[PDB]
Design an enzyme around this catalytic site. Sequence first.
Site, PDB file in Angstrom:
ATOM      1  N   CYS A 106       0.862  -1.158   0.000  1.00  0.00           N
ATOM      2  CA  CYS A 106       0.000   0.000   0.000  1.00  0.00           C
ATOM      3  C   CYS A 106       0.908   1.219   0.000  1.00  0.00           C
ATOM      4  O   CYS A 106       1.620   1.398   0.947  1.00  0.00           O
ATOM      5  CB  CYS A 106      -0.882   0.085   1.280  1.00  0.00           C
ATOM      6  SG  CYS A 106      -1.874   1.609   1.347  1.00  0.00           S
ATOM      7  N   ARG A 109       0.311   4.710   2.994  1.00  0.00           N
ATOM      8  CA  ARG A 109       0.237   4.288   4.358  1.00  0.00           C
ATOM      9  C   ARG A 109       0.685   5.474   5.209  1.00  0.00           C
ATOM     10  O   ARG A 109       0.586   5.402   6.427  1.00  0.00           O
ATOM     11  CB  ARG A 109       1.160   3.123   4.655  1.00  0.00           C
ATOM     12  CG  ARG A 109       0.544   1.752   4.318  1.00  0.00           C
ATOM     13  CD  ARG A 109       1.594   0.704   4.586  1.00  0.00           C
ATOM     14  NE  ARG A 109       2.523   0.496   3.474  1.00  0.00           N
ATOM     15  CZ  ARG A 109       3.654  -0.182   3.585  1.00  0.00           C
ATOM     16  NH1 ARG A 109       3.997  -0.644   4.787  1.00  0.00           N
ATOM     17  NH2 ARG A 109       4.453  -0.377   2.511  1.00  0.00           N
ATOM     18  N   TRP A 278      -8.948   6.330  -0.509  1.00  0.00           N
ATOM     19  CA  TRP A 278      -9.302   7.115  -1.676  1.00  0.00           C
ATOM     20  C   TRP A 278      -8.326   6.711  -2.800  1.00  0.00           C
ATOM     21  O   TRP A 278      -7.227   6.202  -2.542  1.00  0.00           O
ATOM     22  CB  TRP A 278      -9.229   8.632  -1.352  1.00  0.00           C
ATOM     23  CG  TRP A 278      -7.943   9.146  -0.750  1.00  0.00           C
ATOM     24  CD1 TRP A 278      -6.741   9.361  -1.404  1.00  0.00           C
ATOM     25  CD2 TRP A 278      -7.737   9.567   0.612  1.00  0.00           C
ATOM     26  NE1 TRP A 278      -5.808   9.841  -0.515  1.00  0.00           N
ATOM     27  CE2 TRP A 278      -6.389   9.995   0.719  1.00  0.00           C
ATOM     28  CE3 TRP A 278      -8.555   9.608   1.758  1.00  0.00           C
ATOM     29  CZ2 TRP A 278      -5.843  10.482   1.934  1.00  0.00           C
ATOM     30  CZ3 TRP A 278      -8.013  10.101   2.968  1.00  0.00           C
ATOM     31  CH2 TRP A 278      -6.672  10.531   3.040  1.00  0.00           C
ATOM     32  N   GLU A 283      -4.722   4.046 -10.676  1.00  0.00           N
ATOM     33  CA  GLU A 283      -5.498   2.820 -10.428  1.00  0.00           C
ATOM     34  C   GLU A 283      -6.659   2.753 -11.413  1.00  0.00           C
ATOM     35  O   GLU A 283      -6.920   1.694 -11.989  1.00  0.00           O
ATOM     36  CB  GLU A 283      -6.075   2.761  -9.013  1.00  0.00           C
ATOM     37  CG  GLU A 283      -5.071   2.481  -7.902  1.00  0.00           C
ATOM     38  CD  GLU A 283      -5.749   2.479  -6.525  1.00  0.00           C
ATOM     39  OE1 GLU A 283      -5.854   3.551  -5.896  1.00  0.00           O
ATOM     40  OE2 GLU A 283      -6.206   1.384  -6.085  1.00  0.00           O
TER      41      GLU A 283
HETATM   42  C1  HEM Z   1      -5.885   6.707   2.129  1.00  0.00           C
HETATM   43  C2  HEM Z   1      -5.741   6.419   0.840  1.00  0.00           C
HETATM   44  C3  HEM Z   1      -5.024   5.234   0.310  1.00  0.00           C
HETATM   45  C4  HEM Z   1      -4.228   5.235  -0.798  1.00  0.00           C
HETATM   46  C5  HEM Z   1      -3.937   6.451  -1.656  1.00  0.00           C
HETATM   47  C6  HEM Z   1      -3.803   3.876  -0.994  1.00  0.00           C
HETATM   48  C7  HEM Z   1      -2.953   3.462  -2.039  1.00  0.00           C
HETATM   49  C8  HEM Z   1      -2.926   2.124  -2.403  1.00  0.00           C
HETATM   50  C9  HEM Z   1      -2.728   1.609  -3.729  1.00  0.00           C
HETATM   51  C10 HEM Z   1      -2.496   2.446  -4.968  1.00  0.00           C
HETATM   52  C11 HEM Z   1      -2.759   0.262  -3.659  1.00  0.00           C
HETATM   53  C12 HEM Z   1      -2.602  -0.696  -4.832  1.00  0.00           C
HETATM   54  C13 HEM Z   1      -3.990  -0.950  -5.419  1.00  0.00           C
HETATM   55  C14 HEM Z   1      -3.970  -1.942  -6.574  1.00  0.00           C
HETATM   56  O1  HEM Z   1      -3.040  -2.009  -7.406  1.00  0.00           O
HETATM   57  O2  HEM Z   1      -4.940  -2.674  -6.720  1.00  0.00           O
HETATM   58  C15 HEM Z   1      -2.994  -0.078  -2.319  1.00  0.00           C
HETATM   59  C16 HEM Z   1      -3.066  -1.360  -1.864  1.00  0.00           C
HETATM   60  C17 HEM Z   1      -3.484  -1.690  -0.580  1.00  0.00           C
HETATM   61  N1  HEM Z   1      -3.840  -0.866   0.411  1.00  0.00           N
HETATM   62 FE1  HEM Z   1      -3.973   1.067   0.258  1.00  0.00          FE
HETATM   63  N2  HEM Z   1      -4.236   3.128   0.045  1.00  0.00           N
HETATM   64  C18 HEM Z   1      -5.065   3.831   0.817  1.00  0.00           C
HETATM   65  C19 HEM Z   1      -5.809   3.418   1.932  1.00  0.00           C
HETATM   66  C20 HEM Z   1      -5.817   2.105   2.489  1.00  0.00           C
HETATM   67  C21 HEM Z   1      -6.531   1.718   3.629  1.00  0.00           C
HETATM   68  C22 HEM Z   1      -7.492   2.595   4.423  1.00  0.00           C
HETATM   69  C23 HEM Z   1      -6.155   0.402   3.883  1.00  0.00           C
HETATM   70  C24 HEM Z   1      -6.645  -0.493   4.961  1.00  0.00           C
HETATM   71  C25 HEM Z   1      -7.162   0.020   6.089  1.00  0.00           C
HETATM   72  C26 HEM Z   1      -5.228   0.000   2.869  1.00  0.00           C
HETATM   73  C27 HEM Z   1      -4.658  -1.263   2.716  1.00  0.00           C
HETATM   74  C28 HEM Z   1      -4.176  -1.644   1.458  1.00  0.00           C
HETATM   75  C29 HEM Z   1      -3.928  -3.056   1.141  1.00  0.00           C
HETATM   76  C30 HEM Z   1      -4.138  -4.217   2.096  1.00  0.00           C
HETATM   77  C31 HEM Z   1      -3.500  -3.098  -0.132  1.00  0.00           C
HETATM   78  C32 HEM Z   1      -3.109  -4.347  -0.912  1.00  0.00           C
HETATM   79  C33 HEM Z   1      -4.390  -4.939  -1.508  1.00  0.00           C
HETATM   80  C34 HEM Z   1      -4.125  -6.074  -2.485  1.00  0.00           C
HETATM   81  O3  HEM Z   1      -3.191  -6.925  -2.312  1.00  0.00           O
HETATM   82  O4  HEM Z   1      -4.854  -6.101  -3.499  1.00  0.00           O
HETATM   83  N3  HEM Z   1      -5.024   1.072   2.051  1.00  0.00           N
HETATM   84  N4  HEM Z   1      -3.081   1.078  -1.519  1.00  0.00           N
HETATM   85  N1  LIG Z   2      -6.963   3.276  -3.113  1.00  0.00           N
HETATM   86  C1  LIG Z   2      -7.141   1.944  -2.882  1.00  0.00           C
HETATM   87  C2  LIG Z   2      -7.047   1.407  -1.517  1.00  0.00           C
HETATM   88  O1  LIG Z   2      -8.070   1.515  -0.902  1.00  0.00           O
HETATM   89  N2  LIG Z   2      -7.460   1.034  -3.812  1.00  0.00           N
HETATM   90  C3  LIG Z   2      -7.672  -0.385  -3.488  1.00  0.00           C
HETATM   91  C4  LIG Z   2      -7.917  -1.265  -4.723  1.00  0.00           C
HETATM   92  C5  LIG Z   2      -8.761  -0.514  -5.768  1.00  0.00           C
HETATM   93  C6  LIG Z   2      -8.414  -0.920  -7.223  1.00  0.00           C
HETATM   94  N3  LIG Z   2      -7.014  -0.655  -7.470  1.00  0.00           N
HETATM   95  C7  LIG Z   2      -9.254  -0.200  -8.280  1.00  0.00           C
HETATM   96  O2  LIG Z   2      -8.715   0.458  -9.195  1.00  0.00           O
HETATM   97  O3  LIG Z   2     -10.491  -0.261  -8.238  1.00  0.00           O
END
Ligand code: HEM
Ligand SMILES: N=C(C=O)NCCC[C@H](N)C(=O)O
Lengths: 407, 411
Positions: A106, A109, A278, A283
Site C-alpha cells: 500500500c 500508508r 481514496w 489505479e
Molecule cells: C488513504 C488512501 C489510500 C491510498 C492512496 C492507498 C494506495 C494504495 C494503492 C495504490 C494500492 C494498490 C492498489 C492496486 O493495485 O490494486 C494499495 C493497496 C493496498 N492498500 Fe492502500 N491506500 C489507501 C488506503 C488504504 C486503507 C485505508 C487500507 C486499509 C485500512 C489499505 C490497505 C491496502 C492493502 C491491504 C493493499 C493491498 C491490496 C491487495 O493486495 O490487493 N489502504 N493502496
Molecule cells: N486506493 C485503494 C485502496 O483503498 N485502492 C484499493 C484497490 C482498488 C483498485 N485498485 C481499483 O482500481 O479499483
Amino acid sequence: RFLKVKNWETDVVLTDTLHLKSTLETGCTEHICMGSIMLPTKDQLFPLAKEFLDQYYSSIKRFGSKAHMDRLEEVNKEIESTSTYQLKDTELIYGAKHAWRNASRCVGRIQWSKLQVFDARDCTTAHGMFNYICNHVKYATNKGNLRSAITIFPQRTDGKHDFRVWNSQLIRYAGYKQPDGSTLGDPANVQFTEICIQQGWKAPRGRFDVLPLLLQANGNDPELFQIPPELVLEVPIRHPKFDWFKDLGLKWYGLPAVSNMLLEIGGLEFSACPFSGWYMGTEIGVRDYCDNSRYNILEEVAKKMDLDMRKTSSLWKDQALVEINIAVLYSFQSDKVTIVDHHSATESFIKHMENEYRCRGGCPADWVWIVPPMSGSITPVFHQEMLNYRLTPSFEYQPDPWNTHVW
Amino acid sequence: RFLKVKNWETDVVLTDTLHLKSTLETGCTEHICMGSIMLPVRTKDQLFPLAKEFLDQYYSSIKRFGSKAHMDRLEEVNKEIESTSTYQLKDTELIYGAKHAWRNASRCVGRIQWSKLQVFDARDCTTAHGMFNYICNHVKYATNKGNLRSAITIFPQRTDGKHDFRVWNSQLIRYAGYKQPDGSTLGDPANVQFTEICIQQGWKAPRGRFDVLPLLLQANGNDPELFQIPPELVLEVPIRHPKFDWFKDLGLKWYGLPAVSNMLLEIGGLEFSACPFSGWYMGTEIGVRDYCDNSRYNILEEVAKKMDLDMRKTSSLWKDQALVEINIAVLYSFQSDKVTIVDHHSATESFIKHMENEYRCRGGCPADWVWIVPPMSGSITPVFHQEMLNYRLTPSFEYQPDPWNTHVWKG
Ligand code: HEM
Ligand SMILES: N=C(C=O)NCCC[C@H](N)C(=O)O
Ligand code: HEM
Ligand SMILES: C[C@H](O)[C@H](O)[C@H]1CNc2nc(N)[nH]c(=O)c2N1
Ligand SMILES: C[C@H](O)[C@H](O)[C@H]1CNc2nc(N)[nH]c(=O)c2N1
Ligand SMILES: N=C(C=O)NCCC[C@H](N)C(=O)O
Ligand SMILES: [Zn+2]
C-alpha cells in the site's frame, strides 16, 4: 541481520532492523526470488495472542506493567476456557491501524494512523451487514471529502460460521459475456456477476452497473442487497482539453473499498473487514481503463486523438495513456472528490518510509506494487530500495467464498 | 519440484523446472525479499566441480554427453587444474559460455537475441595498447555504420587476482561529467567520479555537455592507461522531434552503441574481469533514464517549459507529458539516422515470446521483474502482467567493485 536500503537518486541510506520481528514467510528462498508472484488450535493461538498484546502494551508504554500481565493472564484463561478470545475495543482499533501500517503493497500508508474503525462484531445477519456497510459507505464518502474507514465483522469461530462479503470491493461494475463474443462492462467481474444473477439479481446489462452486495452472515447462504444508489458517488470522466472525451461515456466511482480480504489480529481472523481510503489516479486511468483485460479503451482514445497507430514506436499508446490519466484526475478534482496523483502519493510514501525507519526501524514495502504502473522512474519510489517482509497484524488474501461455501 | 508462473492478462500458466539447476544465491530468504535491492582468489578445491558442471552442460548442448570426447576433455581439464591450478577454455566452449551468460542474464530484456552474439577472443592480449586495439575493433564491428551487431570482447581471465585485466570505464562510450564550483554539474552526473579519475591521469577535458570519455585500460594488473577512441568510430545521433521544431535547439544528442564494460563474466569457474559487451538501445534507456532521471541530464523541466504545460500542479501530469515527447524524439532520431533502436512495446513483446519459448525448450527463463518492466508506461507493456522467477544460473555476468577502489598502484 541489520539491513541497508539505498535510495539511488538521493544516496540516502536507511538501516532496517524491523524485519527481525518478521513472522510469516515470503515465498522466496536463497535459490529463488518470488517477488513478482501475485499470490506466493488452542496451542497455536496463545503465542499469537501474546505476541500481539506484548506489542500493544509496548505501544502504550505499559510493557511489563501489572495491566499488561493481567491481560495476558485474562486472555490466556479465556483461550484455555473458550478456545478463542475477544479483543478490547482499544486492541481492535490498534490491530486494524497496524494491519494497514504493515500492508507492504500500500503506497498510501502515510495515513495509517487516521483510520476510522467501525466495530461490527455485534452483527448477526446479512441485513445487519448490509446496514453497517451502507453506513461505512456514507461515512467514508462524506460527500466527496473521503475519510479512511474499516468495518469489522465477527471473527472466524470454527470456520463453519464465517462472515464474508462475496464482492471483491463494496462498489464495482458488472461484467457480461455476450453472444457477440465480446464482454460488456468490466471483464474482471464476469464470474461474480453470474453468481449474483444465478442468486437472483436482475441485471440492467449496461456497461457500468453497480453490482449488488452478496453478503454472508454466520456461515449462512449469502444474500443480495442493492446499495442505495444515492450513496454511490460516481464521477463522469471529461478531459480539460479534449471536448470529445465526454462522448466516450466513461465514469468511475469515488470510493475504493476492498472487501474480500482477511484481517488477522493477535491470531484472530476477521474474514469480513471491508476497508476504504481514496484513489490514486493511475489505479483507474492506467489499470481499470487500459489493461487489455479490463475496460481496454486505449485503442478508442488513440483514434479520437488521431495518433499514428501504424507503428508501436510512435508511442501512441503512451500518448493516449497520459491523456486518459489527466482526464481521470481532472474529473475527480472538478467534482471535488478526493483523488491523489502518482507523483504526490509516491513522494508522500518516501516521507512515510523515512518516518518509519526513524521511528520504528523500518517499513515493509513491495516495490513491484508500490511503483506506479505508469511513469515509474520519474516517481521517487522507483529509485528507492525496499525490503519486503510480513508483519502481523496483517491483511491477507483468502480464497473466493464460492469455491469454499457449502450451500 | 515444479514452479508455476501465470500471466494475469492472458491466463497462460508456465511451469519452471530449470530453477532446479540453480546454485548461486539471491539475497532473499523465507523471511525477507530483496528483489528490489540493486546489489544484494579461487582454489582447485572449488574449481573442478565448477569446470565439470560447465563441461557437462557444454557436452549436452552439442549432444555429446558421455562421449569419449566429453570424457577426454574432463580428464584434460582436471589434469590441467591441479597441475597449473587453473585451465584454458577451448574457443568453442568460450563462445558457448559467453552466449549462455547472456541467455542467463535475468535483468536483460533483449535476450531473444542471445544466440546471435559475435564473440571476439582477446585472450592473447597482453598490454593496454593491445586492449585499445581490440576495443576499437569491437566498436567498429558492432557499430557497423548504424546497423548494430551484438558483440563481446573477452580479455584474459583472472589468475592470482594481482594481474587482472579491467576496463575502468563503466561503458566503452559515455559522456564526461564535471562538478562545478557553484555545485551544478556540466555533462552527465553519473560519470563525475570517473571523469575526475581521467583528468588526474592526464586527460585534457573539453569540458562540454557531451564529451566522449577516454578509455582507461588496465592490462595484467598494471596501472591503467588512457586512450582516446577515434572520433570517427563513435557514432552519435542528434535528438530532434517529429513535430516540435524547438526540440533540436535543446542541444541533445546520444551515442548509438550501448557497451557495458565493467561486469565480470564467469564461465566454468573461470573469471573474465574485462568482457565488454554491446547490443543496441531500447529507447527508454536514453529517453527515460539518461535524460530524465533527476540524477542524470534532468531535462524534464526545460522540455515542459518549451511545451508550455501547466507546471504549477503535478496533477496536470506535465512530467508524464514531457516524458512521452522526449521518448518519441529519441526513437524518431535513431530511426531517421538508420541507427538500430527498439521501442519498449516491441522489446517487451519479443521478450514475452522469448520467455515462453524458453519455458518450452529449456524448462525456464530466470527474469528480474524489477529490471524487465520499462521505466515508463509499465502496465501497458505485457511484461508488467507476467509473473517471473528470478534465480541465478552460470555462466553468468556478475557485478564487480570499481577498480579504483581495489587497485594497488604501481606508480
Ligand atoms: C488513504 C488512501 C489510500 C491510498 C492512496 C492507498 C494506495 C494504495 C494503492 C495504490 C494500492 C494498490 C492498489 C492496486 O493495485 O490494486 C494499495 C493497496 C493496498 N492498500 Fe492502500 N491506500 C489507501 C488506503 C488504504 C486503507 C485505508 C487500507 C486499509 C485500512 C489499505 C490497505 C491496502 C492493502 C491491504 C493493499 C493491498 C491490496 C491487495 O493486495 O490487493 N489502504 N493502496
Ligand atoms: N486506493 C485503494 C485502496 O483503498 N485502492 C484499493 C484497490 C482498488 C483498485 N485498485 C481499483 O482500481 O479499483
Ligand atoms: C541486442 C540488444 C539488447 C537489448 C535491446 C538489451 C536490453 C537491455 C536493457 C534495456 C537492459 C537494462 C539496462 C539498464 O537499465 O541499465 C539490459 C540489461 C542487461 N543486458 Fe541486455 N540487451 C541487449 C543485448 C545484450 C547483450 C549483447 C548482452 C551481453 C552479451 C546483454 C546482457 C545484459 C546484462 C548483463 C544486463 C544487466 C546490466 C546491469 O545489471 O547493469 N544484453 N539489456
Ligand atoms: C505479475 C505482477 O506481479 C502483477 O502484474 C502485479 C505487478 N504490480 C502490480 N502493482 C499494483 N499496485 N497492483 C497490481 O495489481 C500489480 N500487478
Ligand atoms: C531500487 C531499484 O531496485 C532500482 O531503482 C532499479 C529499479 N529497476 C531498474 N530497472 C532497470 N532496467 N535499470 C535500473 O537501473 C533499475 N533500477
Ligand atoms: N541495451 C543495452 C545492452 O546492450 N544496454 C546496456 C546499458 C545501457 C544504459 N542503460 C545506458 O542508457 O547507457
Ligand atoms: Zn525475493
